Amino acid sequence: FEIKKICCIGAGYVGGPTCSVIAHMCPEIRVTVVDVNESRINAWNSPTLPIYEPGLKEVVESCRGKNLFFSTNIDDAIKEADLVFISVNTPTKTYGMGKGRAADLKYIEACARRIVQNSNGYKIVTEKSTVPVRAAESIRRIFDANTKPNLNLQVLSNPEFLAEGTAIKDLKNPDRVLIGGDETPEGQRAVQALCAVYEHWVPREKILTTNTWSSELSKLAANAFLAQRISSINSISALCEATGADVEEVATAIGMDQRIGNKFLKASVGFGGSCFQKDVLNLVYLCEALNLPEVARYWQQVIDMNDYQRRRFASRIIDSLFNTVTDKKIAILGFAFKKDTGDTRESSSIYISKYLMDEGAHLHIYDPKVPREQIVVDLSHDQVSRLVTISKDPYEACDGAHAVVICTEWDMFKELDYERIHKKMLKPAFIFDGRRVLDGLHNELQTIGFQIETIGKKV
Amino acid sequence: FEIKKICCIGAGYVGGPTCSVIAHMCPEIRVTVVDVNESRINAWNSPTLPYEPGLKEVVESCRGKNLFFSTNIDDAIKEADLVFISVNTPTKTYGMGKGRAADLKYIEACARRIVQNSNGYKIVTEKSTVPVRAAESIRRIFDANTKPNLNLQVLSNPEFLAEGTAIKDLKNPDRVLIGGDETPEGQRAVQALCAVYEHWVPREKILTTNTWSSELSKLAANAFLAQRISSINSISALCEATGADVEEVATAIGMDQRIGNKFLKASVGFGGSCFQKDVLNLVYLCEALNLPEVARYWQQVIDMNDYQRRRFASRIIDSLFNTVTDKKIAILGFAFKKDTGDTRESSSIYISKYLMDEGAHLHIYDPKVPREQIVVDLSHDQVSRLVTISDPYEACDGAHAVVICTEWDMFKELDYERIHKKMLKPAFIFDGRRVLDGLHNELQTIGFQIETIGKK
Amino acid sequence: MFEIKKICCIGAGYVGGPTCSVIAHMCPEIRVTVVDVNESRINAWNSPTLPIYEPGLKEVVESCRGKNLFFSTNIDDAIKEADLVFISVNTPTKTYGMGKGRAADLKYIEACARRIVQNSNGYKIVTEKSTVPVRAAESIRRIFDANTKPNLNLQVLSNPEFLAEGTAIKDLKNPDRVLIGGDETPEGQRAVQALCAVYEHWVPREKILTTNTWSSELSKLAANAFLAQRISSINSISALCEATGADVEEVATAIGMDQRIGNKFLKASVGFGGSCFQKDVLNLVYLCEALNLPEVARYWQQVIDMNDYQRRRFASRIIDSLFNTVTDKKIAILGFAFKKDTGDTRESSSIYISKYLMDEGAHLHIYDPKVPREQIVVDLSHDQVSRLVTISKDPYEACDGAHAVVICTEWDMFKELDYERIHKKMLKPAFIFDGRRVLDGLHNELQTIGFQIETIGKK
């Protein structure tokens, strides 16, 4: 048995790129990506994709209309498929039991029930969404309770490890592929059918197979470790400001230890993105349920450090602006949660902006990729109409500003003409570098007259 | 300025090896290692050194030519261009900061002795692990005791070697770290120390920083390393509650090249002279700098390590029917890591103290640890009523449980068939090191009950 | 159709002695051998002076001993000949190690199980009468299974005890119920039925309850927690009565006439004592933590905390009433046993009140009609005792030259003392602190005599 038609439920940052890459690497597999969101599906069927990922357009364009399809017809795409990926979102619950902590599984469950509603025959159902440990067992129980003659649904776990902004490079050359399934003959056979898909472009030695729960736990563990490295160096950065040390020199010296490695040691105003906080919290919430309070409070520190790193930076801005930013114009340079994406989910720029808005600052926000309307949405819930301007270029944001706040490490911000900017800022003029992108320009900036501050450098 | 005469105060683990390697690599540089203890200096000149692989060869290669070991501290200081400070910096066992803060009295003593014995220009390098900003204290002592023409430059040059691999780590280090003042005088001194290391270390691997970055990098490095162990150990507790295997999880985690695959081996808890001592110093320092969030962040590295030992001990007590009073328990393994006989902060000590408090009879075996050092570490007797020091088979004669606390290879190749028949039943085995992976089926078969970190 | 004809009891204490004595009295055709490692205790059992005081015990022992009742230090031989083996050893709270001050010490239980298996052949029934933590029985099962011998068949039963000290013989001869726990295996029921038939000589079958091992162990812990809680509840009301001018005895009557509440165990006191109530609530508390029920743990913890408050409160009232100082003041303590009709002092409130007053430097003269002097000394020792503690031969010697009379145990004789005689020889002003309400109805006479009388639950 061999997978020949693939259906993917969820046309988001995971569903689209992963399916686009599968189609591009397996010309003989038909890959259909489906979603309830019609405007998102329409945009996938357009010259202007709904997300910005470098090289995604070229991949999509190569296979769309041939063996890659984007549709709102969820039902037909399930009936046709040999393999169904579940790739819907799993946000933190904002309500009820576990509000602010537990994963929200309602989209997952709606998938599982639409799958068993539309399925006949043999299908492999593969949970790619990041879910709590034992969640695949939930899907298995829904299927077993709703069996039909000749219906044989197998459940696999297949966690996704791409990072946004490098999704295509990550999907074409993954560090590893992880697949969990039962230890039964049917489970192993289903695992092997999914292996065969990835083996069109990924070496077998890079494909890890385990059971379902080990698989789900590895995904959470991996994200928490990555988040921990950032929070660890961000904590070091606070120690650096207090002692005269420099966090970049410390990160360099530590990273040269091969047992530690040199990746993910770039101090910042705080990690953003849709999954780091929600996945650590999911891990914390699970610990509570399993009577592991010590494990819960150990990983909670990764989130508390990150919140402290953000609130620290907002206070510096206010405290350096003579402890009042009411009615002062402040340029926010960079709103995406990192560079090379238009995605703002949990971006540190949202939290810095809201802290400054609470003080009555007039924000002018520039980002080269994030859409105008998404910034308004993120800073909503008006305060926005009175205090927030979206700028079309960095110079208009800095025009008449008291302070320039770099929140996203876009390459272009290093190259700006800061003499032009200084000339038209109010005096004294501040730059708060939340990303360490202006290292090496500090002396030049100082001569120009800016008071420049950055994470992990004593003032 | 060219460093041609080197003196090093402290002929300990850090002191001699580093200086022996320097002399071996730098043939025309005079290297004199001096120390308070004469008995130790005589052992450094004797056939038996006070052991690291390859060290005996490097010592005898150049001792007497450009490498000397004298008890004559003051003359070594007097004509040396470079003075290494490599003295022990124990934790304070008293006073403010008790048990956490570093005790700088041996460094202070070195600073005052250096300034008394020095004229002209000398570079003074702190190799010891010190709290950040310690170099400021050394400079203060120097500036307060100035005399004409005296010019002492203070650098930081922390060491990173691991015990057991010192010569490999020193002939081929991942990096050499040198911090000094970001002043013209400071850069003179830094370049002179670099030029030393450049005789065998590529310039690419010689990182230079300001003094405080160099001090902090040493602490922060040990803390990241220990944070990794605590992180996987915390994961190992989850693997037990969820039916995952910490070995498979760790393989999956470690294949992310941004995480790396090193220091992900779950254990009963990290020992060694420095991981706990240096995270604790880091924490103490944060408290003093009014960074409580940072402090409680790094405290979790120790709290998790403490919890991993405590919960291992509870597992033993709870599996043995909730009481180990007057039960014989074998401790196989007392050193903090395999293939050495060093016990500092070893996990066995804590596991053994947890079981002595219950009144269990511990029979301890270790192939490399002296039996006088085990006694000392379980003391301050209650030791004599509960602790007899065994070969491993007699440590397991009539025991209820075998507890493996150090990953000795010899523990894999034992005759657990024989051991099981001469143990009380039910016979238990508690593997705190995952050294019995792959043999579990047999053990269950032998009738043994086996429990390990991160499984079941 | 299997008959128990020889019975061994391991542990000749306040449970083993009485229970087997009534067994021998009510079943003349069964031989009951009581054993213990304590040689002075067993010899006391073989004397005209028994090691404990229970009303009616001397009659029952002497009417059976050397007939079918026996006491011996020969532990091994009693086991080999025995069809039924009781384990009645002590399960004190651990004073060391993990769970110090909370968890039950099982060292003596295990030693019994291992001595039994080393001395057993053929068929025997092993019954756990000691109060053990839930699932303790299972542990005995697994020591028996791991040390099997060619024709062994040790069945394991739970059979908690509900006698109260002071009324043990009445309670053993007319128990409200008998509780037996055993396996649902075929021979599980056969072994339960065997032990039933022993009790059915004198207990009606309707009063014998049969369940499984772990429900029976839990029923015993829960029973003591409910009883202790009634005492703590009325004691807390006693504090409210003092503050509001109500009488706790009147309020207890009003409460207790509700038949859903019942009128037993509503006698307010200085505080509950005895070897089992505190150690068993704590055992329940320690079990909740391990089972991840911190809410249940802190609910039952209140029973203990309220008891400790009642005692502290009582001592503080003595000290406050004596002009806030009792250093060098002679104070009479009447009643040292933990309740009346026993010589037993285990966890007696008299110990705690005495230690509170010794901490103040008071000089105490203690009288108790049954507690032997040596025992009092041990209870107060760890001298401070040589300087501060006198053990009196009669109550008037205790009261001679005293500032205060503190009644801690409800012996009937304290109502009958000659308080006029006592008052003439006390230092003035003279106080009585009635921690048992035994002097109710004497308050007016006592006042006219000139005493300042204070009691629990009255303003």
Ligand SMILES: NC(=O)C1=CN([C@@H]2O[C@H](COP(=O)(O)OP(=O)(O)OC[C@H]3O[C@@H](n4cnc5c(N)ncnc54)[C@H](O)[C@@H]3O)[C@@H](O)[C@H]2O)C=CC1
């Ligand atoms: N964003 C990232 O970089 C990665 C995220 N993940 C995980 O992958 C999952 C998906 O994440 P994203 O793509 O970022 O989310 P997203 O919100 O961008 O996209 C999920 C899509 O699912 C659709 N959807 C939800 N319920 C549906 C239903 N019942 N039927 C059909 N469509 C439905 C939504 O309309 C949405 O377009 C999450 O579990 C996330 O934690 C894992 C790796 C990478």
Ligand SMILES: NC(=O)C1=CN([C@@H]2O[C@H](COP(=O)(O)OP(=O)(O)OC[C@H]3O[C@@H](n4cnc5c(N)ncnc54)[C@H](O)[C@@H]3O)[C@@H](O)[C@H]2O)C=CC1
């Ligand atoms: N043990 C390790 O793996 C490493 C330790 N370090 C740091 O290096 C330092 C040295 O540690 P070790 O070499 O293990 O200790 P050690 O105790 O073996 O060596 C210290 C030596 O200095 C001598 N000494 C102490 N005070 C003296 C004084 N006032 N005058 C003259 N000699 C004096 C001692 O007698 C001894 O010979 C510590 O701060 C440690 O944290 C850094 C890297 C690795």
Ligand SMILES: NC(=O)C1=CN([C@@H]2O[C@H](COP(=O)(O)OP(=O)(O)OC[C@H]3O[C@@H](n4cnc5c(N)ncnc54)[C@H](O)[C@@H]3O)[C@@H](O)[C@H]2O)C=CC1
């Ligand atoms: N005392 C009471 O009012 C009640 C107590 N219980 C429970 O009954 C049990 C016994 O209580 P008590 O009789 O008051 O205690 P106890 O301390 O007066 O009697 C236990 C006896 O067992 C002996 N013993 C200890 N280890 C032994 C061993 N290995 N072999 C033989 N004998 C050994 C002790 O020396 C002692 O004489 C406890 O679990 C208690 O909680 C249950 C109901 C009533």
Ligand SMILES: O=c1ccn([C@@H]2O[C@H](COP(=O)(O)OP(=O)(O)O[C@H]3O[C@H](CO)[C@@H](O)[C@H](O)[C@H]3O)[C@@H](O)[C@H]2O)c(=O)[nH]1
């Ligand atoms: O050294 C660093 C690295 C990252 N960040 C920040 O950390 C966040 C996370 O970035 P990154 O991990 O690169 O992007 P994500 O898109 O969130 O990818 C993460 O989250 C995905 C969703 O689960 C995982 O699949 C990926 O492996 C994991 O890298 C961003 O705000 C970054 O700016 C830093 O501040 N310093």
Ligand SMILES: O=c1ccn([C@@H]2O[C@H](COP(=O)(O)OP(=O)(O)O[C@H]3O[C@H](CO)[C@@H](O)[C@H](O)[C@H]3O)[C@@H](O)[C@H]2O)c(=O)[nH]1
């Ligand atoms: O995956 C792992 C790796 C190590 N350990 C334990 O962690 C401890 C540390 O081992 P190791 O790092 O080899 O010991 P040290 O000799 O103390 O070396 C550390 O301490 C030195 C003193 O500061 C530093 O120079 C080194 O870089 C640092 O590795 C030992 O008890 C190990 O058993 C684990 O439990 N799991």
Ligand SMILES: O=c1ccn([C@@H]2O[C@H](COP(=O)(O)OP(=O)(O)O[C@H]3O[C@H](CO)[C@@H](O)[C@H](O)[C@H]3O)[C@@H](O)[C@H]2O)c(=O)[nH]1
């Ligand atoms: O209304 C009351 C009843 C009792 N007490 C005190 O509470 C303690 C316990 O007394 P009691 O329950 O009569 O005696 P125990 O010997 O502790 O008997 C209890 O503990 C035994 C051991 O578990 C159980 O078998 C019994 O059922 C249970 O009553 C004593 O200090 C009493 O003076 C009061 O203060 N007020």
